[model samples]
Target: HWGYGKHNGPEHWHKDFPIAKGERQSPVDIDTHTAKYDPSLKPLSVSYDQATSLRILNNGHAFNVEFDDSQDKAVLKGGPLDGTYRLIQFHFHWGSLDGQGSEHTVDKKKYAAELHLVHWNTKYGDFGKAVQQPDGLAVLGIFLKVGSAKPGLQKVVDVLDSIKTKGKSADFTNFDPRGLLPESLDYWTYPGSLTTPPLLECVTWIVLKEPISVSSEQVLKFRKLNFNGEGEPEELMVDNWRPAQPLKNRQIKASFK
Candidate 1:
């Protein structure tokens, strides 16, 4: 169910998103030029054919997607990743035009919204079990800025009509989400918590520094969703981002040289 701005917003998230407290949250400002570089981490790679099993589901909040583990043969499949990660779901975090939307900030620039590609280590059996493990989850954070045109976001936007109303989402049987991945795989990696409640602290965060552009209309479509469920009329549920929390003596690493 959608839980933004109501009794379920960020502050009250822990009740629903229990993992939120422990999950390694991303977007921690990284001074890329800093001398404290980690020579061990390498850039992540994903083949265009690696995302064959993409399925779109409307989980009340937004259009969440699950990637078929049977089709992900990317280089990062089992590499240094603590466990075998598989794309399980994807969702977004946004804010009202009246305020800002990004969950993580650098220096002080907040993007229009942030998209999270959620993955779980298949070794742990399933997403539910993996959620309890310290290294059972991986997430890709991509910032979306409101702009003139955003061909990259067309595939997602095209399906807005299918999920136009709250708690109403049509299944996108043959959808492919690879088109939504940023061309530059350059990213910032770290340990963080889920932005949602429970905010599990088990997530491995990979945040893309470069943002993809989306039309102002796309932003509006996202705003159209309501915090209420299926029975209620569609109301504005736009400002859904949580305020940034403290890093608690942790250092976040970026893949950019």
Candidate 2:
């Protein structure tokens, strides 16, 4: 299985998935000085219904909060996108310690953690079908810094104990993902991949410039999750983020100056 370990890490992914060496790979370093400001970019419009949140699953790779994208209940529009994209699920990537976890870095600076809110374009009918196309997915990346406690993230942290093992899951609802976002809608846009295996180059990356705050204690809860299932020798789940891929010839457009 593909993972962050040295044996099966990103560097070795191209062996099985040729697209891992694709030109438009994800989790690139965002040099703010070089990022072009696009005044034409629209303000991000996000609408998420709390009830659409279905369940939380520990998929061994990471803990994901899946949502009901059957309808247009939770959707994102505007901001470097041509059509609406339904919110499918959201997950996190973190390191064993503070200061180094996020996949995409700003000005070469790494944050404690990163949050990925996955969405699929409505034009393609569904996520599965959409993912095959070049303009299929749109992922909103939010950086998480170690600082003051975030009440918005408390509900998510409270359930960590229940999902400490791989393949474990629980009914999660009444959670508004919008609450976790920072105040500013400012973001950087680019074309990228899944950041994981199969490494599909079908994502329109919208990465937020501002980072949300999370306490160091709260961040530690994520590391407690195991990469292996029950009865297996315990392996702490950390450093799950892929290293920043080469930018190549791509241009990063910023929503604000």
Candidate 3:
């Protein structure tokens, strides 16, 4: 019911989830000039096991690749985190066209898409409990631009046909997420939320400054996925990104000079 439409779009989300207008709402406009570099920040450490990836599914709002997080096989550490955060899932946000799709914009510049690798701090015991804490989750946001085809993503594109409708899922295993990361991990860290419904203010967002390439043809396949399930009217899953919110008293810190 919380689909991106005239009825249940981002503007209307606050009605149900009161925190949508909270002080730390996500997808804040990242002005490169506004972000201050901090020498105190440590370089981020990421480790992913190919076997951690489980399946990919159309979760009504956006497609997500779920991981087997029973162990710390795929974890994120350093840079804004207190300790190890287990990688739980990874998903994307895109627009109907290539011009605007990413949720987090750099200096008001929007990319074709955005990839979110979500993780939960193991110290919190479990993801369910972690979501309610102030320092519970850590998310890595990578911008996607239309350029030469990304071979690592082709494995994902090939499986889109199997999950065209909402609630649909297919086996997606042994997929190495490292293949999707940019060469440089230079990023701007900030306090933010989920960017979608529930809008919990529990995330430490680490958005990469460098964007990875994604072919226009491959992006077309993502737009082909439906928001509606079988027997419902067709609703293409596009513009799944929430617009930028006010920064309030929050300060974004950069890991680079």
Candidate 4:
């Protein structure tokens, strides 16, 4: 029901979901010059075992590659985090155009797209329960710019054709999204909420300072994938990103100077 059409776009979200204008809203503009460097912030670490990947789905809103979070096979911790955070699923946000596709902008600069590696804090025990508490989630936001095609994302790109409609999903085994990461773990961390509806203020956003590149050809597949269900009329899944919200006085901490 919350597709990206003008009637139901981000501007109209608060009407249905009042928390859309909450204190810790997500995807704020990261002003690099003003970001305070925190030496106390630990370097982020990731250990992803490829076997945890379960399937990929169109998820009606964004493309989600879900994993089996039963164990700590794919996990992230440190860097503004306390205990281990288990990887739940990873998805993306994008604009219809190439330059404006990213969610969190650096120095007001937008990238071609944004990748969200979603994780739930192990302290809460499970994803559903974890989402209900503050500091119960940590998301790794990686920016993508159009350049040479990323070899790491090729397999995922190849499988998009198999799940083109909303709610459509298929088995996707032996995949690791960490391969799509940039060389550096330097990042900016802040308190924020889900970009989608329900707009829960439960996430600690760890946005990467570096960006990865992918060709224009790779993005076309996503636009081709419809947000509509198979029985409904075709509605392309472009411009699904929520615009940057007001910072609401929250300080964004930097892991690097």
Candidate 5:
């Protein structure tokens, strides 16, 4: 199976999924010097209701907080999106250590971790069906730095013990995802794909410029997660991130000067 291992890591992904080598891949290096600043870009509009949160699950890859997107309960608009995009789920990618976990880098600098809030355009009907189309999904990427403890993320961390193994899930509600966001919505926008398998080129990437803080102890907790379920040999869930791919002919736009 495909994993972040020596034999089946990202470099070998193309051998199984041709789309891994597709033209518009994600997690590209964001060179601020080269990114064009667009004054016309509208401010990001994010509305996420706490009630829409369903549960948190360990999917053998990363811990994901799934949301209910049946209606416009939680949605993202503006900032490179033409219509409404409903929030489906949010997950994280981190390394065994604090220095090199994030998938997307700015000016070749990597952060301690990265959070992905996946959303689907309501115009496409559903997430599964929308992923196959060009303008189907939008992912909000927030970088995590190792600094002071983040009170907002403590709720997510509190439930990690219950879902330490793969396939394990726990009730995760009454939590607002917006609390995890940085103060500034200034971001870099581009066209990219999912950082995982099926690498569909349907994502509108919105990577925030300001990063939120998390303590080192909290960062290490993510490394304790298991990639295997019960009764199986356990593998630590770390480095579950794809390397930056070629940018091709795409131009990155910045929401700030």
Candidate 6:
């Protein structure tokens, strides 16, 4: 709901936010190369508490989350997840009610939308500086498809009322966000950049090949987030996802081994 205009989209985001032009931009299409499947690449564990502290932030973009240490530490120790990375911020990228969703793409095909669970490597100290390192971050990409139903996302929708207003966020206590992830740990890993502006190129991308389904109504609710500033009437800001970028010379490898 900030001063985002039609021209203020991703392409033009760099104009105001120069970092958007960097090589680390995300949401690129996963094309080229064969996926080296390795079952061992699967996640070691995925543990979450029945209830953990959650903070919703109004970052002029989306209502984001800053998960508590308990949940963060628990997630960090789970196998592949226990590597050099530490839990960072998590956000989403969605589409308008009437258009294609998904921030990233495969062979130019767009899904309903895409969710990114961003993590940073502890070697760099904190996320602020880690993002600049060679292995600064790891993102888990989950595609959202409009379908019959998706019960996994009920927790998120349950708290829709907290941040229903622009610049307004409330505490989301006793809720588990892990349910949002698909059960299949098999994922595709690649060396790519960020999807948003100032696209960093140091991220290790771990995108799940299988997408999780969500009801059409559930999708509509996400779009209802306030697009305008804090005071004006809330405008629909659903299509926050950027179109797929050129893969360039980057390699996309799968962990189906």
lDDT of each: 0.67, 0.92, 0.92, 0.89, 0.92, 0.67
For model 4, where is the 10-residue window of minimal lDDT?
45-54
Pull out the clashing pairs in model 4: 95-101
Instruction: Estimate the TM-score for candidate 1.
Output: 0.84
If scored against the real structure, what TM-score would every candidate get?
Answer: 0.84, 0.98, 0.98, 0.97, 0.98, 0.84
TM-score of structure candidate 2: 0.98
Return the lDDT, model 3, position 143: 97
Q: Mind giving the per-residue lDDT tens digits that candidate 1 earns over 156-186?
A: 7777666655556655555556766666877
lDDT of 4 by residue, 164-245 (tens): 8988899998887878899999999999999998889999999999899888898877778888889899888888888889
For candidate 4, report its TM-score.
0.97
Best-to-worst order by TM-score is 3, 2, 5, 4, 1, 6
Off by over 4 Å in 2: none
Higher-lDDT candidate among 2 and 4? Answer: 2
lDDT of 2 by residue, 33-111 (tens): 9999999999998887543887999989899999988889988899999999999999999998897999999989999
lDDT of 6 by residue, 1-257 (tens): 11345767766766655656555456677763455555555563444553354677655566676666433463443334436565555777777753477877766778887888777776667777877776777777888888866786776766766677667777866555677777686667667777765566767777877888889888888877776666787677677777766555655666664
- In candidate 3, stretches whose alpha carbon ends up further than 4 angstroms from where it belongs are none
Q: How high is the lDDT of residue 152 in model 4?
A: 89
Model 1 global lDDT (CA atoms, 0 to 1): 0.67
Candidate 1 Cα errors over 4 Å, as ranges: 14-36, 48-50, 53-55, 70-80, 231-233
Residue 71 accuracy (lDDT) in model 3: 84
